[PDB]
Amino acid sequence: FGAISSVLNDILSRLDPPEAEVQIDRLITGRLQSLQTYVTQQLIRAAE
Amino acid sequence: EVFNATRFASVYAWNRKRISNCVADYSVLYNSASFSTFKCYGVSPTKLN
Amino acid sequence: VKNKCVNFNFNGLTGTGVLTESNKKFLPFQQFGRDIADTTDAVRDPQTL
């Protein structure tokens, strides 16, 4: 999702919080959007 | 042999040395006052150890 | 230490989980393995292979 790595442990163990915050925020945004999409699809299928 | 050497190559002919098969202590390098510039990109220096 | 949930730092690869003996076998060039979902599931001990 634009971050340096897709694993939170790598970012935590490689970067200090002040600069790792941006990568963690990008990962959070991407994963939150994916989860919201999944929940919406599940709601529609549950209605079906 | 790289930091405490006596010869440094020119800028357009910069000298590259490969480091492998050993253990590196970056903490002593970072905490020393001999260096007037120590900046790390993609990693933080304090975690290099 | 095996059969206990611990933090493991396997050759720079950090994580948390339970280490157990594996019936799975690695070819003698592979270091770690991934699941169908690409989550790490196996590792090779740097000191015991």
Q: For residues A27 and A3, is the Cβ–Cβ distance under 8 A? A: yes
Residues of C in contact with A13 (CB under 8 A): 14
The one-letter code for the residue type at A45 is R
Nearest CA in chain A to C14: A9
The one-letter code for the residue type at B11 is V
Q: For residues C8 and C41, is the Cβ–Cβ distance under 8 A? A: no
Residue A10: which residues within 8 A CB-CB, separation 6 or more? A4
Residues of A in contact with B43 (CB under 8 A): 14-15
Does B43 contact A16 at a Cβ distance shorter than 8 Å? no
Do the strands C32-34 and C13-18 form a parallel or antiparallel pair, or are they unpaired? unpaired
Nearest CA in chain A to B44: A15
Q: Does C14 touch chain A (CB under 8 A)?
A: yes
- The span from the CA of C31 to the CA of C17, in Å, is 18
Q: Whose CA is closest to B3, among B12, B15, B11? A: B15
The one-letter code for the residue type at B10 is S
One DSSP character per residue, B2-49 reads: -TT-S----STT-------SS---HHHHHH-TT-S----SSS-GGG--
Q: For residues C43 and C20, is the Cβ–Cβ distance under 8 A? A: no
Does C contact B via 3+ CB–CB distances below 8 Å? no
| Triad C27, C35, C42: Cα angle to 5° | 50
Q: What is the resolution of this structure in A?
A: 3.2
- The span from the CA of B42 to the CA of B29, in Å, is 18
Neighboring chains of C (3 or more beta-carbon pairs < 8 A): A
